[PDB]
């Protein structure tokens, strides 16, 4: 196999036998074959748009297919085989439509050679063998490979956010059109300038999409607000909801009300605690456990059903006993785990089986007590702008350090905990995404009532951090966003974090420290372009990076 899309890739060059995440060769290869089919859909879908007859019937299929290939999202080979077969049928429909339109417009049959993605077909028996030859290493030129894969990796992060926006009824034609433009580009021989421009256009579409999801979430569930979240447990059985999807949360809360089954969040569902629409339910206890990578012992000790709305779902250890109470939904899949089917349009998902099962389970084992404070998304922080601005002017807050991003298992990530613990006491950490778990259970206190860790929410809520920075740029009358007293020390793991990075680069942020390692998918020449254009830096020692950041460097 070959896969190098997450921070944990083997030797920081690429997984070749079995993924460090657990992804087997067969699964990895099927994900490659799906992306190949998506490129075929894109070839025709882009041409139909160019001919003045766009077809948007595959918008949801494309978003969900990309999302299913994100790290820790879907482990069920049958789901991939089904998507590949459906994708081939969708592609052929577009092809037939295209051939007719082309003939009408040109007075002749289409006869130009096309990439194999546009024409290859087979039944499911043929998938495993074909998959071996349509992966990443089929691009021989290392720089073209780097730029094509950087594009696809950012694109699938954008697709995840777009899917959540679509679930909530929010969509923009430019997003769906760009999915096909970007996918199709990876089958064309383009100049370096053209390939880099596509990556920067993806960063701009990440801004669009992150803004759309921010709109979708807050319009539907209210603006996040300051909230104290219990991390201890109650005395009823519970259901633990993980991942990112807030519509799934809304439905789970409604369906569990009055049943005697409590609801707890996990991981990237922690920010559901911050939304007014959800805070109104007394049986919503709080947040259980830590970061995604600790889930094997924590899902075990939770004792009740676990619902995965998105990644990250980690494979079970041999000794784990919770498969029978593990539920997947949306793009998530796992062999042997019960899947909750998509809601009908205008309707809701059916979580009744989780509720019936939870009633048969013991309450969660308490693994800690206390609380987490959060809910500092853009509306809440801008509501406190006068207070924040005065603290900056008085010197009570000397600097903000953006430590948003995504966590992982490597021990080198102790760096983030140690930076948080050793930053001077007149600094404030701004966070969003599971990177927060390296420092959100410390006792850093507050500065004049402003907590020293301000959690804006999920990784998508990095959008709020950009809104806040842009507000502060305006208040302080600065010409360049980089001249604010803000440093960026971002942790990444998977593809959504890469989309957030590209959005920040599109917004003009320079000097970002990215860690705990730099992506394997940046070739030496591409890495050099990014360094020269954007001053991206690797992490150094805790002492050196704190001293540099405090100097604004
Ligand atoms: S998702 Fe990450 S750990 Fe898993 S196979 Fe790909 S690069 Fe390796």
Please characterize this protein's 3D structure.
The PDB classes it as oxidoreductase. Keywords: oxidoreductase, hybrid cluster protein, aerobic desulfovibrio vulgaris. The assembly is monomeric. Hybrid Cluster Protein from Desulfovibrio vulgaris. X-ray structure at 1.25A resolution using synchrotron radiation. The protein is an alpha/beta fold. The protein has four domains: 1-139, Substrate Binding Domain Of Dnak, Chain:A, Domain 2 (Up-down Bundle); 140-223, Substrate Binding Domain Of Dnak, Chain:A, Domain 2; 225-375, Rossmann fold, CATH 3.40.50.2030; 378-550, Rossmann fold (3-Layer(aba) Sandwich). The protein has helices at 25-50, 59-68, 77-106, 127-131, 142-167, 173-185, 192-221, 246-256, 276-279, 295-302, 352-358, 378-383, 385-394, 414-422, 462-475, 495-506, 524-534, 542-550; strands at 227-230, 238-242, 262-265, 284-287, 306-308, 326-329, 338-340, 371-374, 399-402, 427-431, 446-447, 450-451, 453-455, 486-491, 513-515. It has a six-stranded parallel beta sheet with strand order 4-3-2-5-6-7. β2 (238-242), α8 and β3 form a beta-alpha-beta unit. The longest helix is centred in the N-terminal third of the chain and has 30 residues, at 77-106. The chain is globular, with a radius of gyration of 23 Å. Iron/sulfur cluster is lined by residues 3-6, 8-9, 15, 19-21, 23, 28, 71.
């Amino acid at each position: 196999m070959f896969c190098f899309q997450c921070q944990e890739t083997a030797k920081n060059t690429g997984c070749t036998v079995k993924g460090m995440c657990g992804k087997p060769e067969e699964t990895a290869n099927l994900q490659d074959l799906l992306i190949f089919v998506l490129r075929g859909i894109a070839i025709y879908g882009e041409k139909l748009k160019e001919l003045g007859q766009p077809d948007r019937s595959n918008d949801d299929f494309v978003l969900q297919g990309l999302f299913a290939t994100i790290t820790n999202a879907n482990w069920d080979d049958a789901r991939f085989e089904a998507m590949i077969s459906e994708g081939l049928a969708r592609r052929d429909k577009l092809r037939n439509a295209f051939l007719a339109v082309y003939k009408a417009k040109n007075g002749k049959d289409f006869s130009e050679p096309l990439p194999e993605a546009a024409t290859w077909t087979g039944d499911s028996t043929a998938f495993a063998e074909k998959a071996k030859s349509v992966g990443i290493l089929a691009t021989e030129n290392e720089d073209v490979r780097s730029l094509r894969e950087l594009l696809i990796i950012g694109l699938k992060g954008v697709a995840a956010y777009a899917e959540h926006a679509a679930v909530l009824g929010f969509r923009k034609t430019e997003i769906d059109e760009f999915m096909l433009e970007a996918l199709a580009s990876t089958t064309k021989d383009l100049s370096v300038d053209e390939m880099v421009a596509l990556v920067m256009k993806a960063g701009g579409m990440a801004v669009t999409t992150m803004a759309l999801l921010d709109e979708a979430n807050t319009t539907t569930y209210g603006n996040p607000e300051i909230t104290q979240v219990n991390i201890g447990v109650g005395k009823n059985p519970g259901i633990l909801i993980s991942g990112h999807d807030l519509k799934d949360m809304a439905e789970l809360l409604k369906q569990t009300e009055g049943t005697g089954v409590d609801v707890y969040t996990h991981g990237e569902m922690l920010p559901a605690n911050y939304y007014p629409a959800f805070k109104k339910y007394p049986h919503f206890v709080g947040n259980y456990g830590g970061s995604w990578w600790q889930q094997n012992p924590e899902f075990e000790s939770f004792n009740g059903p676990i619902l995965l709305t998105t990644n990250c779902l980690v494979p079970l250890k041999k000794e784990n006993t919770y498969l029978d109470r593990l539920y997947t939904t949306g793009v998530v899949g796992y062999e042997g785990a019960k899947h909750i089917a998509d809601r009908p349009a205008g309707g809701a998902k059916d979580f009744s089986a989780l509720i019936a099962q939870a009633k048969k389970c013991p309450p969660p084992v308490e693994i800690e007590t206390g609380s987490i404070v959060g809910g500092f998304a853009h509306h809440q922080v801008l509501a406190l702008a006068d207070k924040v601005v005065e603290a900056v002017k008085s010197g009570a807050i000397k600097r903000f350090v953006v430590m948003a991003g995504c966590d992982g298992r490597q021990k080198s990530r102790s760096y983030y905990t140690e930076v948080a613990e050793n930053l001077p006491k007149d600094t404030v950490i701004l966070t969003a995404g599971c990177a927060k778990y390296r420092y959100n259970k410390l006792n850093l206190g507050d500065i004049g009532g402003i907590p020293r860790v301000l959690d804006a929410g999920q990784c998508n809520d990095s959008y709020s951090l950009a809104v806040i920075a842009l507000k502060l740029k305006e208040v302080f009358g600065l010409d360049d966003i980089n001249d604010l007293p803000v440093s960026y020390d971002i942790a990444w793991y998977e593809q959504k974090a890469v989309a957030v990075l590209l959005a920040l680069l599109f917004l003009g942020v320079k000097g970002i420290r990215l860690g705990p390692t730099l992506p394997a998918f940046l070739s030496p020449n591409v890495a050099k372009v990014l360094v020269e254009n954007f001053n991206i830096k690797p992490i150094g020692t805790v002492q050196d990076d704190i001293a540099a950041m405090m100097a604004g460097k």
